[model samples]
Target: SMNPPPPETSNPNKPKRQTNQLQYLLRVVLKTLWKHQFAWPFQQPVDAVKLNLPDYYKIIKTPMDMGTIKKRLENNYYWNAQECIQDFNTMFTNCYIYNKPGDDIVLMAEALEKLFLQKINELPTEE
Candidate 1:
């Protein structure tokens, strides 16, 4: 029997392997963010009235049977503006460019921007 030849090695000078791992990770994060994006808005309100915007809190909170007022405040307290914006951008780009249009993509993008601006305004300024 003839001996098998050794497999050729990759060129060390060539660029390293390319992967969409980042893209995939971004997609996962974006999807999660989109799903939970309303949490922040719900938290901003002092009572049920604030949480009633677009009627989302009613849907999610009712199913979970949570305290609408308390949950909203807690969610607002834990909100991270940077992460929210990053995730929103990823979702907007991915959905608009690669996926089909949906009911909430644009709305969420706008909401994220508004929230970011609101947070920026609240930041302390150096004298």
Candidate 2:
């Protein structure tokens, strides 16, 4: 006869998992591009200049951030692989990201930016 598993327990004082959508999606984009995953995982970048620039807009209908969403698979196109990852990392830090939603994005953006940029700058620059 097989033994049963022990009861589950949780900590009340531990920090809770964040609900930072911007961070989550951006990481997905990074991994998606780095690993050469086949599916396009984000919305198209906001375009078609509108009548006004109000500065900020909430999700029109879904939890996804349109501001961060810069690519979608269509018409014989793959997502901009590198551009979207770098662009979102910047956008998530400079403007699109919010603190109340959890700030792992900020920490992650800063950390990854410093590390990646240092690596790039070390590469040969000549044509």
Note the residue pairs that clash in candidate 2: none
lDDT of 2 by residue, 30-121 (tens): 34333332212222232213413233233221123222332221111223334323544544444334333445544544554555454444
What would the C-alpha RMSD of candidate 1 be, to one decimal place?
Answer: 19.5
Q: At residue 73, what lDDT does model 1 achieve?
A: 24
Instruction: Work out the TM-score per prediction.
Output: 0.24, 0.29
For candidate 1, the lDDT comes to: 0.35
Per-residue lDDT tens digits of candidate 1, residues 1-127? 1222221223344333212332322244323433455534322222334433344333322121112223322234213334234433443343344223564645654565465445445433322
Q: How many backbone clashes does candidate 1 have?
A: 1
TM-score of 1: 0.24
- Root-mean-square deviation of candidate 2: 19.2
- As for candidate 1, its clashing pairs are 43-72
Candidate 2 Cα outliers beyond 4 Å, as residue runs: 1-89, 95-97, 100-102
